[PDB]
Design a protein around this nucleic acid. Structure first.
Ligand code: K
Ligand code: K
Ligand code: K
Ligand code: K
Ligand code: K
Ligand code: K
Ligand code: K
Ligand code: K
Ligand code: K
Ligand code: K
Ligand code: K
Ligand code: K
Ligand code: K
Ligand code: K
Ligand code: K
Ligand code: K
Ligand code: K
Ligand code: K
Ligand code: K
Ligand code: K
Ligand code: K
Ligand code: K
Ligand code: K
Ligand code: K
Ligand code: K
Ligand code: K
Ligand code: K
Ligand code: K
Ligand code: K
Ligand code: K
Ligand code: K
Ligand code: K
Ligand code: K
Ligand code: K
Ligand code: K
Ligand code: K
Ligand code: MG
Ligand code: MG
Ligand code: MG
Ligand code: MG
Ligand code: MG
Ligand code: MG
Ligand code: MG
Ligand code: MG
Ligand code: MG
Ligand code: MG
Ligand code: MG
Ligand code: MG
Ligand code: MG
Ligand code: MG
Ligand code: MG
Ligand code: MG
Ligand code: MG
Ligand code: MG
Ligand code: MG
Ligand code: MG
Ligand code: MG
Lengths: 49, 204, 53, 148, 85
RNA sequence: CGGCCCGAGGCGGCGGGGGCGACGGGCGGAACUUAAGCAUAUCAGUACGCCCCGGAGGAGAAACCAACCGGGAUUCCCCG
RNA sequence: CGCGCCGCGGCGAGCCCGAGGGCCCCGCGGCGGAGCGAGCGCGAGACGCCCCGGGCCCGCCGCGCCCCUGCGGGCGUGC
RNA sequence: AAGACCCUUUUGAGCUUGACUCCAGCCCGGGCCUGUGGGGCGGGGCCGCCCCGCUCACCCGGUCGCGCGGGGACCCGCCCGGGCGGGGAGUUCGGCUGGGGCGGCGCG
């Protein structure tokens, strides 16, 4: 489901701590806000540097 | 469960009375035949499926006999000239294993087929016998089948001549990764050429 | 350029200078011979650009 | 530029500074570094002591980022505080609002003791201290601290 | 040294401790196969030595055949059960 | 007398073989040269010989690296 | 192409057209900033237009003395 | 005709051998190839050797397979080990010096 809307998924990686999860969940939560699904704007460069 | 779990367990007892008798009858027979011979069906059906065989039109099996022991150089009168580090004649070892040499011999005999894989069947003091799987790539059952028709594309011609089979991969060192393997991954020649290149940039 | 032909010295004892010669005796392979290579041929690895802060 | 070189001033001189008696030949000493213990021994002992031999333990693979260890002296500590704030901190030598400086954020591990500090309490957090860095810091009213 | 020295190491974050990670069917297949094969000739030699209480000889012989001390100890333990009588 | 097994001769449709001064893959493999001599070493896992593809090829989704408040298939570039 | 020294330009406890991305714009290492010790490791202020010498401080090797958290700390002496 | 005699160069090559370092080849031993039986000697408290039947592996002959043999678990081959080895390979064969060599050693 996440691959479909532009998120890269790496099942080989494992988290090493609890902070690693909170920092990236907040990153996932934010991106889902600024995404629209169908005069539209194409985003340049790396997304959320 | 199924039957092939028992057959695999059995083949891990090659020293037993039963398999010692059956291994004896096979080497006597293979000693009475030619070096390269077509087989009706695989001698080991369970190992054949482990390596990719399928009982369909377009898969074939041949038995190949190769000779045991080391390597002797082709030098007239047994004379190497040159430096003394390069003088040896007998007692050398081939770079490829005997399994890889079996596949290359049968690829040369049958150049209109595609070599897939191979496995061991017998040995004695003078010979080892391997069986080689080959696919005919212009048969319609082969071409229209998504499981195998990767081999119908032309970058798959004479694979064993280019070191791309499993036994050919081992001699190039490619069953390893990590420390001890950093100078071989594209090719031994490719890593040497990359590591010895003079790159003269414009704004040097 | 200058090194596609076959030429070797005749040596002393034949009353001629010691440069390499083509079969027949024609001078070759020296910067002072007609048709020979340059003494130090030009190469594209010359540093063409320069740096400025 | 070829037109300002010393070698073009020798056109017409038969031998381009290499002499008549000696001359310019191919390799009159050998190639490279050869001869260092025999016929260049007078050169190698005058300028290169300790070129020959062995010395010390060997490690078959060094970990470059384990052995890495940056350091900072105490005389450089107050320059990590931005200039807009230093005056005020000196103004009020507070024990109850002293400045905290965490030097790992700036990329240092150990604190050494060359120099001196201003008369002002300050807190320094690091991974290791030298003995006189601690001594000069406690002389000022400061405290050392260890951080993760 | 293979670690970087610092007290309070690991003091900022909370680690994740992953779970560390039989099959009676396989034990059942071996029991049928064992019945119609027996043991290998080197395994029978070990059993005879173990019956005579030459334990160190049995370990030496298994290291020579197997080439790895942990497997040679695992095999001699495996064979004692059939070597007790 | 039929079946299965292991072989033989013929007939039909389809496929293979040879070619290239580069790049690419797999094998066999020097000596000149340097060491101010010369055997180990170096030149060079190069010249050259044999085989095999393609428009690229090879490699590739960890029996990996690490020792961190850790990364995460392959290839290529910068850096030591 | 690599090494040494000299001269000139820009900036200076800093410096820098990597590769790359948008003769212009943005752009990591790196080198310098601390040394010494085979290594465990420990770690520099006291003077001086400049130069030369003296004195003292840091490390490596040795050794009085006192002590707390102890084959660990402090204070000294010597090539 | 850039002395062919003579000398020097850390330039060669042909030949020789009691130079230095080695290689083919050959001889010798154990192992795997490799069956199925019968016996003797010795040791240590099961181990080492050796000997001799059979035929089925493996090997050789006769024959137009026209009415037949001989050997045999030994030989060959392969792996590792030891010996012989100018038949062959590569390389070396100091310096000073009233020219070099013989001799001598102001070569430490
Ligand atoms: K054969
Ligand atoms: K030669
Ligand atoms: K030669
Ligand atoms: K050599
Ligand atoms: K391999
Ligand atoms: K490696
Ligand atoms: K030529
Ligand atoms: K001449
Ligand atoms: K001349
Ligand atoms: K530059
Ligand atoms: K000069
Ligand atoms: K001179
Ligand atoms: K020379
Ligand atoms: K030279
Ligand atoms: K030297
Ligand atoms: K040593
Ligand atoms: K070679
Ligand atoms: K050479
Ligand atoms: K060579
Ligand atoms: K030589
Ligand atoms: K040489
Ligand atoms: K060497
Ligand atoms: K060599
Ligand atoms: K070499
Ligand atoms: K020391
Ligand atoms: K002459
Ligand atoms: K002469
Ligand atoms: K003379
Ligand atoms: K002469
Ligand atoms: K010469
Ligand atoms: K010579
Ligand atoms: K000659
Ligand atoms: K000759
Ligand atoms: K000779
Ligand atoms: K000889
Ligand atoms: K000679
Ligand atoms: Mg001439
Ligand atoms: Mg020309
Ligand atoms: Mg003059
Ligand atoms: Mg003139
Ligand atoms: Mg000179
Ligand atoms: Mg002179
Ligand atoms: Mg001259
Ligand atoms: Mg046909
Ligand atoms: Mg050359
Ligand atoms: Mg030389
Ligand atoms: Mg020379
Ligand atoms: Mg020479
Ligand atoms: Mg090399
Ligand atoms: Mg491909
Ligand atoms: Mg002359
Ligand atoms: Mg002459
Ligand atoms: Mg000389
Ligand atoms: Mg010679
Ligand atoms: Mg000669
Ligand atoms: Mg000779
Ligand atoms: Mg002389």
């Amino acid at each position: 489901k996440a691959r479909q809307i532009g998120i890269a998924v790496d099942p080989r990686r494992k988290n090493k701590s609890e902070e690693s999860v909170a920092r990236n969940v907040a990153r996932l939560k934010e991106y889902l806000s600024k995404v629209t699904i169908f005069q539209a704007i194409q985003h340049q460069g790396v997304v959320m540097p | 469960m199924g039957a092939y779990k028992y057959v695999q367990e059995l083949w891990r007892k090659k020293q037993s009375e039963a398999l010692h008798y059956l291994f004896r009858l096979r080497t006597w027979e293979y000693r009475q035949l030619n070096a390269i011979k077509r087989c009706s069906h695989p001698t080991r059906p369970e190992k054949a499926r482990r390596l990719g065989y399928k009982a369909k039109r377009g898969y074939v099996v041949y038995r190949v006999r190769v000779r045991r022991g080391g390597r002797k150089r082709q030098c007239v009168h047994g004379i190497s000239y040159g430096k003394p580090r390069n003088i040896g004649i007998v007692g050398l070892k081939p770079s490829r294993s005997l399994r890889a040499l079996a596949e290359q011999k049968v690829g040369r005999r049958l150049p209109s087929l595609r070599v897939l894989n191979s496995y061991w069947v017998a040995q004695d003091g003078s010979y080892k016998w391997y069986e080689v799987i080959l696919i005919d790539p212009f048969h319609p059952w082969i071409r229209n089948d998504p499981k195998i028709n990767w081999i119908c594309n032309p970058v798959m011609k004479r694979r064993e001549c280019r070191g791309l089979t499993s036994a050919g991969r081992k001699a190039r060192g490619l069953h390893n990764k990590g420390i001890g393997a950093m100078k071989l991954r594209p090719s031994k020649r490719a890593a040497w050429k990359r590591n010895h290149t003079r790159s003269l940039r414009r704004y040097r | 350029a200058g090194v596609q032909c076959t030429a070797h010295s005749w040596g002393p004892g034949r009353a001629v200078a010691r440069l390499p010669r083509k079969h027949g005796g024609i001078g070759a392979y020296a910067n002072f011979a007609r048709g020979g290579h340059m003494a130090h041929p030009t190469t594209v690895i010359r540093r063409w650009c320069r740096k400025v802060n | 530029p070829t037109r300002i070189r010393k070698s073009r001033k020798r056109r017409g001189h038969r031998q381009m500074g290499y002499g008549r008696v000696g001359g310019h030949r191919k390799h009159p000493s050998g190639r490279g570094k050869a001869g260092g213990l025999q016929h260049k021994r007078t050169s190698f002992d005058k300028y290169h002591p300790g070129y020959f031999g062995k010395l010390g333990m060997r490690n078959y693979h060094v970990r470059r980022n384990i052995e890495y260890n940056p350091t900072i002296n105490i005389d450089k500590i107050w320059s990590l505080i931005p200039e807009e704030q230093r005056d005020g901190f000196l103004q009020r030598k507070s024990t109850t609002e002293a400045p905290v400086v965490d030097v790992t954020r700036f990329g240092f591990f150990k604190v050494l003791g060359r120099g001196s500090l201003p008369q002002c309490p300050i807190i320094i957090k690091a991974r290791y201290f030298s003995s006189d860095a601690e001594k000069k810091l406690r002389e000022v009213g400061g405290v050392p601290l260890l951080v993760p | 040294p293979g670690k970087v020295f610092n007290l309070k190491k690991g003091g900022a974050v909370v680690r994740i401790v992953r779970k560390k990670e039989t099959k009676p069917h396989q034990e059942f297949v071996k029991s049928i196969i064992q019945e119609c094969t027996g043991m290998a000739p080197y395994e029978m030699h070990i059993i005879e030595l173990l019956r005579m209480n030459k334990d160190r000889h049995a370990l030496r012989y298994a290291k020579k055949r197997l080439g790895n001390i942990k497997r040679a100890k695992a095999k001699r333990d495996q064979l004692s059960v059939y070597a007790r009588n």
